[PDB]
């Protein structure tokens, strides 16, 4: 509502904003409920004891439980009434020793186990580093938990099989220069033309070998069958205009000791690239 630093922090509604362990009670409207609880059970005269869960306890609260605290305002009432205890009054941490029981404001009774410095209130643990704060007027003790005191009698209505089982979506990782190749194979071959063989990918270099004989994409082109009758003469040009250039002037790169030659013979099909081609450049003709 107003700023908490007005009237110092001596006001009771502004003190728990100052001692910033429970910030969820003012971020939600939970502080309206505990003011309405002590109306409803008349705790304003007699001393009592509260166990406020801290920030982090609200953050570790489960998504199958935090939904059920939103669709049921009665469930938010007794869970916050399950932290206000009227057994021992304004009890410090040294009076919470041994094993025993505690009476809540509304719910049926909750057992505590207090062993020295570790003190459990039943699915909760008092952090004792900041838990012995006592207010003099409207007098109670307040201790800090790390988990909500959730009794099992409330939460048989909740489960994870309602739909709070967490699932992540996985999406496909295709690249846009690859599925632009693959759309031309979806058309039929009378209208897709030379794009109907677009689905074949790059084989390894031994797959075009003489045991396996994988067919390249260029046999399906007409560029394999370029066998004309006509021929350039090459002697009618001016001398110096016919140019030729070898691949490498080396005996050992043109042909190794094995037959794996990239330039001479029938082993020129055994290249790791040159299996597919770019015939999505032209047309669907």
């Amino acid at each position: 509502a107003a700023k908490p630093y007005e009237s110092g922090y001596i006001a009771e509604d502004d003190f728990w904003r100052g001692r910033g362990i429970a910030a969820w009670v003012y971020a939600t409207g939970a502080n309206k409920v505990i003011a309405q609880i002590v109306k409803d059970f008349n705790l304003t005269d007699k001393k009592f004891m509260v166990f406020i869960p801290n920030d982090g306890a609200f953050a570790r609260l489960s998504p199958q439980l935090r939904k059920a605290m939103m669709e049921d305002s009665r469930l938010v009432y007794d869970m916050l009434a399950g932290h206000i205890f009227t057994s021992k009054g304004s009890a410090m941490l040294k009076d919470l020793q041994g094993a025993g029981y505690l009476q809540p404001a509304y719910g049926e009774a909750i057992g505590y186990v207090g062993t020295g410095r570790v003190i459990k209130i039943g699915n909760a643990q008092v952090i004792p580093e900041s838990s012995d704060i006592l207010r003099k007027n409207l007098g109670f003790s307040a201790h800090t938990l790390d988990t909500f005191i959730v009794p099992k009698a409330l939460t048989k209505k909740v489960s994870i099989e309602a739909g709070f089982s967490p699932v992540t979506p996985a999406k496909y990782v295709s690249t846009t220069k690859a599925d632009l190749r693959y759309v031309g194979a979806t058309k039929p071959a009378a209208v897709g033309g030379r794009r109907a063989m677009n689905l074949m990918k790059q084989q390894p270099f031994w797959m075009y070998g003489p045991p396996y004989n994988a067919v390249t994409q260029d046999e399906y082109e007409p560029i394999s069958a370029a066998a004309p009758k006509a021929f350039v003469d090459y002697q009618i040009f001016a001398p110096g205009t016919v140019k030729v250039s070898p691949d490498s002037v080396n005996a050992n790169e043109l042909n190794p000791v094995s037959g794996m030659s990239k330039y001479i013979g029938k082993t020129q099909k055994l290249v790791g690239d040159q299996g597919i081609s770019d015939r999505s450049d032209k047309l669907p003709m």
């Binding site: 020793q97 041994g98 094993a99 186990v113 207090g114 062993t115 020295g116 410095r117 570790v118 643990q125 580093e129």
Partner: protein, 164 residues
């Protein structure tokens, strides 16, 4: 004596193979994680006399019925053997930190324990309740470093699941 070294040497022996590159990689993780647990064990060494005294009072506080005549904590002599038997479990987790695995707990503290305790009529829940206390009074940036508390807690829950 389960360690990181002992697990890969015994698995290379089970297949009759030499130490491969998959085996020296596991010894590298023993080098990185060493500085975490070797100063937790240094912390447990010089401050064990007060940790077991704090943990020793935390089981007679929970189970106050042990001091009854006819129970396991009648006189001072049977009380002295309980602070002794919890000082042994704090020495065996000091061994598990410098080894690198659950070896010294699995041999000398856990194997054979649930038939010793059943025959000698000792409740295992009170050997539990002092182990779960020092797991709970440990806050990670004060008592040790941030990664030493992960290793120190990892053996206390291993001891708890063994007794329970």
């Amino acid at each position: 004596m389960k360690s990181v070294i002992t697990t890969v040497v015994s698995a290379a022996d089970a297949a009759g193979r030499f130490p491969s590159n998959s085996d020296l990689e596991s010894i590298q993780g023993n080098i990185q994680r060493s500085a975490a647990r070797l100063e937790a064990a240094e912390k447990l060494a010089g401050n064990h006399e007060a940790v077991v005294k704090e943990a020793g009072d935390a089981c007679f506080a929970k189970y106050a019925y042990l001091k009854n005549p006819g129970e396991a904590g009648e006189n001072q002599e049977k009380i002295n053997k309980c602070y002794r038997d919890v000082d042994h479990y704090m020495r065996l987790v000091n061994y598990c930190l410098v080894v690198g695995g659950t070896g010294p707990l699995d041999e000398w503290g856990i194997a054979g324990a649930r038939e010793v305790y059943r025959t000698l009529n000792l409740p295992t829940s009170a050997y539990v309740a002092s182990i779960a206390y020092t797991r709970d009074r440990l806050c990670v940036p004060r008592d040790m470093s941030a990664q030493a508390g992960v290793e120190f807690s990892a053996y206390l829950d291993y001891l708890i699941n063994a007794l329970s």
